[PDB]
Each structure stands twice: as C-alpha cells, then as structure tokens.
Design a protein around this ligand. Structure first.
Ligand SMILES: CC(=O)OP(=O)(O)OC[C@H]1O[C@@H](n2cnc3c(N)ncnc32)[C@H](O)[C@@H]1O
Ligand SMILES: CC(=O)OP(=O)(O)OC[C@H]1O[C@@H](n2cnc3c(N)ncnc32)[C@H](O)[C@@H]1O
Lengths: 676, 285, 676
C-alpha cells in the first residue's frame, strides 16, 4: 500500500537471556520492566500525571543539594508540560559532576569507570572511580585558578576522544561552567564560528592526535581559528604526543600535564540550579550558522538515567560500548553522562574499525566483555561489506544487547546484524531521537518488554506523547493507518530549552510550524498495532505525481539483491511532474564493478530498477542509477544526502565545507561519476 | 498557580489605548529581561541599575527583572533635569541605565533619551544604556556601541529563567529622595523587611483580597509607587492599575472614567490631586 | 542579442582541489570562504554596514601602533562611505613596513620572503624574512642620514625589478617617506616630468640592467632627465653590474653597496597616520600629464590583504608569482605589498618569457613550486602562439590557481589557458580593476566559491556596490538585462584619494560625470544571474548606425578561426554614419602570411569578415582588414589601441612618445601596413 512493502514484516518476540549473564549478575539479574503490560500502564501514568512519575524518579536517582518544589510548569490550557515555558524541578539544585563521579567514587572506589583503548591495539588502560575523582578535581582547580574560569563562563573543547577529554568535561561541569565540544576533525573556519558564537574564553585542546593511523594537527587548527577571535584568553594543551614539533607560547599556552600537579586531589562541587545550562552542542545542517543547542542540567541528567535504566536495561556491573565521537549528542549521552551517572563502566575507543583490519570491534568486545553495543548504522554497513570472514574467530558471547542510531536501518541490515553478531538471540534496539530531544523519543525497550519489527522503532519513550500529524494541515491522524509527520503533544524533561543567543530561531524552527506541537521534522507512519516507522526527513521527500515518496522505503528496496552494498536515493530535477528518482548505488565488490560496462553494468542497472518497480512501484523506480565506489558520510553517522542532491542537480561547487564528512576527498569521485 | 489572572491593567495617556497583562505573561517578560541584564548588560548580583523610565508596563517589568538577578534598582522621576539625574547616577554608582526614547504625559513630549545622554556626559561609570522605543519612529540618536534596543535584544532570550537567592538583609532598592539640600539621599531598604511591611499593610490597612484592583494615583519614582504599584498588589496577588497620564488630560473626568471602566475597588490618591479635582467641580462626576 | 554572442556561454563549476596540495598544507588546508552562499551573505553585510565588516578585519589583520576611532566618514545623505571625503580608520597609526617585514621576520625568521630569478637562468637566490629585515633597516638609515630623507619627502625609484628595488620600496616606507616608481624602460622626457611633478629630491637607480638579454642604460637616462631638474640633491646608484663604463660623480652619486655597510642592521619604524600617503603612481594615457595617483596607507594595505585572502585564497605556505613590472599597479599590489604583508613568498622574475625560449615561465613554475600564477593576457597570447611544444615536458602540478589582468580575455584564450596550463582543474580568475581602485572591483573568487563563465569577471568584491548605469543619463539600470557603463555607488578603503597636486582633475575625471557615482570609465553589461561583463573602455566605443559596438565582443569573434593569433578593433573615419569598423589582425604563422597575396590573403580576409558577420552581425563586420606581423603593446599589458587609431586615421605622426610600448620599433611596420 502506502508503505505496504516497508511495513509488511513479521514480529520477532524477544527471547529470555540467562545464558549470557556474567557471574557478577547471574545471581540477582532481573529486568527493570517485567513486560509490555507494565510498559503500557507505566507509560499511561507518565503521560497523564508527570508530577508523580518524574517527580519521584527525579529524587530517587539523582542526588540533590537542595530539593525542588515543582516538578514542572503547566500549560494554562491543560495539565501537561508547556513547550514555550518548559522547565522542570524548579528551585532545586544539583551538581552534575557530583552525581557522575563523586557519588560513586566515594562509595565504590575500586570499580572501573573508564576502560580505554587507543588507536594502536597494544595500548590502553583502566581508570577507577577513585582515580577519576582525583583527576577531575585537579583539573577543576586548574580551570579555576589558572585559566580564570568562573561559574557561567564557557569552555570550548576540541579534543579527540581520549580519557583526558572525558575528565575535562566533568571538571568543567564541576565548577558550574558550560562546556561546548567541537569535533576534532573540523576545519578552522567552522571552529572559529563555534568559538565566537558561544563566546568561549577558554579553549582546551591537544597537540596532535592519531586516528586510523593518521595524524590530526589539532593545535594548529586551534591557533588558526583563534587568529580572528578577540575572546580567548587562555589555551590549555594536552601533550598527548610527548615530543612533536609543535609551537607552544608561554603567554597563553598552558601545559595540561604540568599545571595539574600544582593542585590538590580533592576539590568540591559548586551548586548549580536545576535549570542552569549544562552544555551546548553546535550542531549543523550546513545552513545558516551552527546552532548552539542548549540543554539544562536536571532535565538532561534525568533523561539520560531513565534511558539507561529502561531502554538498555543496564546494571551496575555492565560495560557499555558506544561506537561514536564525543562531539555528537550520543557521545554526551552515552559515553560521558550515561554510564558514569548510572554507575556502569564506559568503554572508550578513540580509533576506527577500519584500522588495522575490521576485526577490531570484535576483538574489543571479547577482550573487555562488552555487554552493550550501540553503533551507528553506517559502521554496520561497512562491517557487513568487509564480510563474515572477519568474525570467524569471535563468539561475542558477552553481548546482551545490540542497538543503533542515526539513520534508518534496512531490514536487510537488521537481519544480518541479528544473525551474525547477535546470533539470533540478542535484541536489536533501533532507537530514534534528535539532538534536541536529548534522549530517546521512540524506541524498543530491551529485556523482554517488547516484540520488535525489523526496521521500526516501536513505541514512544516514557513521557513523550508522540502523534502522527496530517502533513499538510491541522488535525492529527486518528486512525489505524496513518501517514504524516511526527510530532509531540507536550514537553518532557530533557527537551532542548533553547538555541544559544537566538531564541527566535528556536521557536520558528520547532514550535511555530504546526503550532501546538513539537515538530520533529521527520516523516513517519503509524502502523497497525502502533509501531512507528520513520520515513526519512520531511525535507527530502521526493514528490512524484503518483504519491509522496519515502526515501527510507525506497532505499530499503534497493539494498535487496545482495550485489548492492549501500544506497542513497536523491530527488532530481526533471521534466516530470515534481522530480525524478535518482539513486547512488555502491556495489559490494570492485572486481564486479570494474568490467566492460556495456557488457555487465547495464544489467546491474536493469536489475536494480526491476526490483524497485515490482516491490514499491513504477513511480518510485529510479531512472538515474549511478554506480559509485562510495557515498559521502558524516562524522555524526549519516549519508550526507544533501551533497549528493546538489552534485546531482548540477550545483556541485556550492557544497560548503567538505570537512563535515568522515571521508572528505570522496567528492572528487562523486562529481566525476555524476557527470558521466 | 493562577496563570490566567490579571496582574497589570494598563491605561495610557491617550484614552483609546491600553491592555492587560496576566501573571503568566508577566513571568515570561520578566524572565527575558533578566537574561538581557545578565548577558548583554553585564549586570551581576549587587550591582546597580538606574531606571529613568516613565511609568509604563515595561518599567514595572524592568524593576522586577532587576530584583530577580539580585541587583539593586534605583528609580529617578522621568521629569527630572540632567543635573539632578547626574548626581543620582553617580552617587549610587550605577553602571547600567534603563530608559525610553520619548514619552507622553498630558499630551506633552518628554525627551527622556536626550536627558540621559546629557547626564552621562560627565559620568565615567555607565557602560550600557538600554532603550525602550516606546515611540517607534522618532528622530532620536541611537549609538550601537552602547545603546541596546530593548525590543530587539529581548527576543534572543528564553522565556523562563530562575531567581537568584538573596539574603533577607540585602538591599532591595534605593530611593534618591530630596528636600533640595545637601545632596539626594539614597534611602536604602532591605528585602525581607520591606516586603513584609508592604504585605501587612495591604492586608490590614486596605483590607484587600485577591480579587481586587488597586489603583494608586502616583509616579513610580515615589515611595508610594514602589509600595503600592509594584511591590504591593503584585506581592499580595491583587491586580495593579497603572495609569501613565494625568487627570488633567483630556478633561478631569478621566479618573472617574477609569474607575468605572475597570471596576477599581481601591483608590489611593495624593491630596493635591483631590484639590484640583474639587476645583474642577462636581459637573465632572 | 546585444552581446548575445559574447554572453552565451556555459557555466563552469569549480572542482575541489586536494590532489595539488603540498605536504605543507595538506594536513590543514581549508578555503577561507566555504561557498557562494557565504559570499552572498558576507557581501551583503559588507555593503550594508562597513563599520563592522571592515572595522573588524582592519584590526584582525593589521598591526596598529595606535588604534583607530572611526572606521569611516559617512555621507550625510546615507550611511555609506562618502566619495568626496573618503577616509578610513581615522586617528589610528600604522607603519606599512612593520606589517610587511618586521611582523613576520620577528616571528618566522627562517622562511623565504623573496625568491629571485634573474634574466639569465643560472642565477638566482632566496631571501628570508630575517635577511630582509636587516637589508631594509640598513637602507632606511642610508636614506635617513646620507640622502637626507625626512618624513613626507619623496623618493623616486627608477630601478629594474630586482630584490634591491623591493628592499628600497620597503625602506622608504619605513621612514615615512612617499615613494614613486617609474618603469625602467621610460625615456628621459617622461622621467623628467614624473620627477618634477612629484617633487622628488632623491632618486634611486641602477647603473645598467639586462632584460631579454638587452642592456638598458638606466644611469644615463636618469642623468639626462636631471639636467633640467633643480630639485634633486642626491642620487643613489646600485651597481648591479660591477664593472661597466658608467660615469659616477662623487658630489652626489652614492654607491648603494658601499654606503650600506656603515649602518646598523636594526632600525625602527616611524609612526605614520592611517591616512598618510603610501605611494604615488604616475600613470599615463599619453594625454595631459602623468597622473600621480595617490593611495593612503591603511586603506591600501587592508585592500591588498583582503584580496590575497579571499580572491586568491592564499596561505602562509604559498609562492605567489606575478608576471609583471614593479612600476605597474599590480607590481605594488602583488609583488611587494601583497604576499609580503600576508606572509607568503614572492617570486620575483626580472626578465621576459621570450628569453631564451618561451619555456621559461614553465621552467620557473616547476622549479620553485609556484602555486599562484597571475599573468597579463598579452603574455598569454604570445605563449599560445609559441605553441604547445613548449610545455610538453612540464606538469605544472603545483599550481592551484591561475588568473589574469589588464585586458579582456577572449573565451578562446581562456579555454586554451584552462586546458593546457590549468589542465581543466585549476580555476582561472579573470579580475577587473583599475589603478584608482587599488584592489579588485569585480572578480571570481578562488576556492569553490563561484561558478565561472569564460570571459567574464563575476561578482563585485566585498564592499563595492557596483552598478550598471544608463550610459547617457540619470538612472541606473534595474533589469535582468543591462547595457551601460560601470559605476560604483559608494567609496571603499582603497579607493585612490587624489591626484598629486591636482584635486580638480581628480574630481572632474572620476566623480563629476554621472555625479553621485564613481565613474569607472569602462563599459559593461549585466547578464542574467548577475555576471558582469566588461565591454571595453567607453572612449573606444565605435558608433555604428545600427548600435553601439563593443570592442570586446567583436575582438572575441575575430580570434575564432585559429589562423588568427591576435586582433584589435579600431573605429575608423568613413562616409558611413558614425564610423567604420577596421581591424588589425595578426596571423599565427609567417609562412602562411607571406605568400602570393592575391592567391590567399584575400581569402583570409573573406573568412575573417564572414565570421564576424554571421556571429555578431553586419553592422559590426569589419571593412578594413589589415594583416600585420604584430600589434603595439604596453609595458602595462595592453594593446595600445590609441596608436592604432591614430595611424589608421592618418595622423600617424602625432603618437607621442613611443617609449610607453614594450615593443617600440613596431610603429615602423604599422605605418607601412596601414598605408598599403
Ligand atoms: C548532529 C546531527 O545532525 O544530529 P541530529 O540533529 O540528532 O539529527 C536528527 C536526525 O537524526 C535522524 N535519526 C536518528 N535516529 C533515527 C532513526 N532511528 N531513524 C531515522 N532517522 C533517524 C533523523 O533523520 C533525524 O531528523
Ligand atoms: C597604468 C594603466 O593604464 O593601468 P590602469 O589605469 O589600471 O588601466 C585601467 C583599465 O584596465 C582595464 N582592465 C583591467 N582589467 C580588466 C578586465 N578584467 N577586463 C577589461 N578591462 C580591464 C580597463 O580597460 C580599465 O579601464
């Protein structure tokens, strides 16, 4: 029907796991939610009266310096939380660092907090909670006395993900300062914009870093960016490499590893209001200017805990491995403010599975008994191409939960992941969320809570009353079958509060369209039995005369016929009503790809169009099939479809800064392939 | 608690203009201003913000916003000349001045910006001036280095912002009163003391209720302005009726028209006004 | 249509370059402007509020001795900068030499500043920034103590372009004196006029110089010119040739190389007001008297930096090669006050590509890894004729940006240049500017910023609100298609301030015609989508009954039919309404040219007229086709059409001084060819 292909799948029930438990929890393990029926009644309560649901969890899991008086500010027209004046846990005080480190370090001092593995396989080490406390405290004093940082100021971090970066972020929070984290691979122009927009005065960096065996000159990029910035007074530099030929200017270059020794190993937390900003994330869609999405402390922290507890069903005895950069929202939520806050160990991996040979993730998982593995789908596709030969010698038995985020997962990939890594026993949690939500919006819950469909997030996370709206106007869609856009009826605790120094952009972007609801920006469909499918961003919908076209559905069709490794569907200007469908297809093996073109590539194209035509339909079937070696990908884990769209359209020059991509250089080929 | 209850009822100099502000709406406006003061004007706890505004809703909001961030406010009657303004600004050591461009009282134009600019010529202190463009298109100089447009800056801030804890004995405000001798006296009143006084008075002298409308016929720069326009009825929970003009304009029946139109229940007026109304004669009632 | 032929071209997008980066920047290279959309918004800001755009760049890139108070003096009727009272960075102080040398020499002392290659291939050397500092300082003391030069005085320079000339100009600036540079090849009459008009008292020269293997007697020319000049008190002579038989008179001939050793190797900069004159250029159109165009210090320097940063997208690690003489405005802007100020190395070449064999430029480019190549179009035409056989053994891989200036470039040439030198990868920047603008007015920007049309400058440079005006009167042309003259609505930082000792001429020439706008003097057309085409000087428009005739368009047509090497179109007096069209055409090969004339030259003429007639039209088609061996060319890089016009008209005697040309002697043939 309208997505009949996409949604016509079998429901997979979750099987109990007991035989993958480690001795640590084997004697007491029990899921936090017993079944779907508890989800259903608890969810109901969360929506109907947040005052009690969040009200209680807020004090049971967070350690407050001062109790709060009000759970939330209500909407005058209804008892639900207001979007425009969203605020929670009013008048209480809470220090995020206290809850993340001291709370545990002072009780369970000899428990691993951080497990670190470097780019080169022979290096790594662990840090216990006691040790973390001491490091955080010394850094906080450095910031306080030498860098001159005061409550409410801003500290920019441009570090690679290393233990020192984690420590730094915690130390900043400890003194009531706001942190802002910029992906280490960004160029100096975008760095400069972020530094200036957020008004930082202190920049924390490294001299050089290594990722995938390649050297990244982090100091030089910072020095460049700061040439046009009047703000910054001090730069703190961590000499990860002890002897590089990197300039160092004593007037404002402080050696992280030399300054630290001058400070005491215990230093107190500064009280912070529950609504004070915790951090900013300068996200970007390469339009306008980077948006300093702002999240407050109590809100964000509660969100992160509830998610760890109910989505991933974690325990204090686990190891949570998040395969992603610290500058991304998942870095914050699941590397630093997730497991540490909860009390689980975090596995930190600075490199890429590419180096030295694709078996790296697996080797990591077994060596450290990783129990949770949360990975971007792009990584999964690359691993899948590498082939099953890279997992022949791994049992991966310790894993108890798999999941992914950042882009729709085709059922084809989901099935591979389930069969080869999860061994048909471990549930795969496909979670849907946005930087601005700060936490999961729609997701399967682990344990035995919900049946799963391959390829579909399932039900709204507690407290979020998601609805599919008529895409054009007015009313929602109250029906057994709905196609529209996803939106939320009321605010929740970790909803981004604003955009740094631009509240108008915030309102116009998210709350003014379809007023009354939070506009997600993504398309969606509500299935029979309530599963919510994500159809792709609204902005990328290709309009064909016959019907709206879901990029998620067509891409899912194209990946069948296992000659295809990857694919992106792009609308393209044509003489047709609306737009033509074009597709960028990556073939699995180069040898098949490089052959006499008339001889065989022509049939590959016939097969690809044939499949879409029969399973999705004639309007969808692509006309332009471009067979390429790869697709542009972002650091954040997504195919950068906007680039493909511009190149395909013909405006291949104005792509903005290529250094948003994880594979810059690729554009050279993309342009040639499109032209011919 | 009671978000859709009138907090401020405002009537302008010209009879056809006015509007109401509810408590919910007031919260949002106060919060945005407090952030403006915090981030753009650089105001910090214990600093001093001078206000030279006419009595308009924005002036009320401003005073509340200043208090919200633990700063001390000082209010100068809008009609004062630049010499006395200068003395008050300097004596109180303000660094931030909040004003308007032009205002109208009794049909006459008061050039508030020019007076401030004059006074500040001899003052080394002030770093920023916030200007509310009550009149949208006057020919008033505006210097970007330190003139901030109240109505443009505000939109950049969120609609909820927290209160800063203040000690019960910290100064709430200063009033530079004068008997035209010596120098203006910055009479200082502390927070817990003053607020309790104001509440007890509302409760026992005027016997008010949450359902009333309290109309005080007097300027914000006077002690009764503070006690009965801003920190009185609002604190108690009654609506405040704010009238920027004079009974003189257009014709002496103005106070009466106001009282019946808005069902005023309490009327507190200076005796001088009463004498003038009395002369006008009973034909006006 | 009206220029339909000229403007009917395909847009060429710019391709990313990564594969031409050198290791020096390979790890951190990123363009200064990310795309057209940033150009567009930034340009908007530059026009709407210069106070912030220039205000900030002015302090971020120039090192001020005293900060300025006001960015500019406004026009009473509008917030834009005044033309009549143009002044910038009021009340600040800035020493140009400090910014050009000391600023870098004191930080990066062992970095090449100047790379010098002589006329003879076996000679050349490099000068580092440290070394430059020492040489400049000694010269400044010489000027101060022996030559008696004081702040505000004038020093004339008549040197060949050699390292010593560069040093001299910097040294003059260092002591607050005004320099004036005269092309070394000028005769004594025009030298005398420039010396006297500018009131110099000190003349700096050489004894003999060699260009193209020929000897230029620079001392004798100066001695001649000074016979009628009561002013000059001292002449400083650099004995480039150590043993020539050149008179030297001790009373006022100082040996540059003997005097210098008496001075210390460090000497301070004198504070100079931001509006003090930096230099004069005695330009000439061979009418009236040479115009001492005057440019002030802060204005000019900022212009030069912004251009280097945004048009050429340079980095500190580049080598910028400008193929042109120091006495021309591009000499100043791109040999001395450009790269040095920025921090790039300058490649200085004293000779001509003609010697020894046309491969010289290429040999230079590869030997020194030149990354930027900026050349006059006349040079390109000569190289093109020489033929592709002279580039068979060069990769020219290091080049990342090509460009040209001084005359319209036919698409035919543009394409050749792009294909054979730029290898279809490097962008070609066709930049339009004037001595009086001091910087680019209309130009493509490098990097990926703009699509390019062959043959058309693109968009106005930041801060310049260019408009096409009705050529006859009043109002501008607000339309999708406009033909008129180019003008600018408001002043910018490096607009010439005046004409030395003749402000009235300045006003009458540039601001009084079409009052309210700066009158460029060149014709222009605004295309669809905003590209600005330059149609040639207004003064040379040939008026035919049918329509105004653009010399640029017709010349572009004539160069097609690749038998034609070069061409100039000249209006000529006839019995026709207005004037006839005449053309001087140079054929590529002499052997084809020298043959039985009735037999073949007659068909060449038929073909040439045929093409113009069909592509441009019947009114344009030439009547007089004169086939010649060459065209007169200037030192400044232009066909000296005025000569051709006079000879053709019949007044072949009154040509003024032939020694303005790079090929004097040519007139002998031009006269014979025209007559017959
Ligand atoms: C830094 C940055 O750009 O991050 P962010 O602002 O968070 O991106 C928001 C987008 O993430 C996508 N997304 C995430 N999870 C998904 C899922 N399960 N299925 C489909 N799309 C999914 C959507 O396309 C959202 O519109
Ligand atoms: C010393 C001297 O004579 O120099 P200058 O005073 O600078 O000459 C000004 C003239 O330069 C020409 N010019 C420069 N760049 C151009 C371009 N891209 N397209 C067409 N014409 C161009 C125009 O003809 C100008 O009118």
């Amino acid at each position: 029907h309208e997505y009949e292909h996409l949604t016509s799948v079998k429901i997979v029930p979750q099987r109990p796991i007991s035989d993958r438990l480690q001795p640590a929890i084997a004697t007491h393990y029990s899921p936090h939610l017993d079944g779907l029926q508890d989800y259903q009644r608890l969810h109901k309560e969360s929506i109907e009266d947040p005052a009690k649901f969040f009200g209680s969890k807020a004090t049971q899991f967070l350690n407050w310096s001062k109790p709060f008086d009000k759970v939330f500010i209500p909407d005058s027209k209804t008892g639900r939380p207001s979007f425009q004046n969203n605020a929670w846990f009013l008048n209480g005080q809470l220090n995020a660092c206290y809850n993340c480190v001291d709370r545990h370090a002072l009780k369970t001092p000899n428990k691993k907090a951080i497990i670190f593995e470097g780019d080169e396989p022979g290096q790594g080490y662990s840090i216990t909670y006691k040790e973390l406390l001491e490091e955080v405290c010394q850094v906080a004093q450095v910031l306080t006395y030498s860098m001159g940082v005061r409550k409410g100021d801003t500290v920019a971090v441009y570090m690679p993900m290393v233990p020192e970066a984690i420590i730094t972020l915690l130390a900043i929070s400890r003194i009531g300062a706001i942190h802002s984290v910029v992906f280490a691979g960004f160029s100096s122009n975008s760095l400069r914009d972020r530094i200036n927009d957020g008004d930082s005065k202190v920049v924390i960096t490294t001299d050089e870093s290594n990722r995938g065996g390649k050297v990244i000159e982090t100091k030089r990029i910072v020095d460049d960016a700061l040439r046009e910035t009047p703000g910054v007074r001090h730069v703190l530099v961590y000499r990860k490499t002890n002897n590089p030929s990197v300039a160092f200017h004593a007037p404002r270059d402080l050696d992280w590893a030399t300054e630290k020794k001058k400070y005491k190993t215990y230093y107190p937390c500064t009280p912070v209001d529950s609504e004070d900003p915790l951090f900013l994330l300068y996200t970007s869609g390469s339009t306008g200017a980077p948006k300093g999405v702002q999240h407050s402390t109590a809100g964000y922290l509660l969100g992160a805990l509830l998610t760890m507890r109910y989505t991933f069903d974690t325990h204090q005895e686990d190891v949570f491995f998040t395969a992603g950069d610290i500058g991304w929202i998942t870095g914050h939520t699941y590397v630093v403010y997730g497991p540490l806050l909860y009390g689980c160990a975090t596995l930190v991996f600075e490199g890429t599975p590419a180096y030295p040979n694709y078996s790296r993730y697996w080797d990591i998982i077994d060596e450290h008994k990783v129990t949770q593995f949360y990975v971007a789908p792009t990584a999964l596709r690359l691993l899948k191409r590498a082939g099953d030969s890279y997992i022949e010698n791994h049992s991966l038995k310790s894993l108890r939960c798999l999941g992914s985020v950042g882009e729709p997962i085709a059922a084809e990939v989901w099935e591979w992941y389930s069969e080869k890594i999860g061994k048909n026993e471990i549930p795969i949690v496909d979670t849907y969320w946005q930087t601005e939500s700060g936490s999961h919006l729609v997701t399967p819950l682990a344990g035995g809570v919900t049946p799963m469909k391959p390829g579909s997030a399932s039900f709204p996370f507690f407290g979020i009353d998601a609805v599919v709206l008529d895409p054009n106007t007015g009313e929602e869609l109250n029906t057994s079958h709905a196609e529209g856009v996803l939106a939320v009826k009321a605010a929740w605790p970790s909803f981004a509060r604003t955009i740094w120094k631009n509240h108008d952009r915030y309102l116009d972007t998210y709350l003014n369209p379809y007023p009354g609801y939070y506009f997600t920006g993504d398309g969606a469909a509500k299935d029979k039995d309530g599963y919510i499918w994500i159809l792709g961003r609204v902005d990328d919908v290709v309009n064909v005369s016959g019907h709206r076209l879901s990029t998620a559905e067509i891409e899912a069709a194209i990946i069948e016929d296992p000659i295809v490794a990857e694919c992106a569907v792009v609308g393209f200007n044509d003489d047709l009503t609306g737009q033509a469908v074009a597709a960028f297809v990556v073939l699995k093996n180069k040898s098949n790809w490089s052959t006499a073109t008339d001889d065989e590539l022509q049939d590959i194209k016939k097969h690809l169009v044939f499949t879409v035509r029969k399973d999705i339909g004639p309007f969808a079937a692509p006309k332009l099939i471009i067979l390429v070696d790869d697709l542009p990908k972002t650091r954040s884990g997504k195919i950068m479809r906007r680039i493909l769209r511009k190149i395909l359209a013909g405006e291949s020059d104005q792509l903005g800064d290529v250094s948003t991509l994880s594979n810059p250089g690729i554009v050279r080929h993309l342009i040639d392939s499109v032209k011919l």
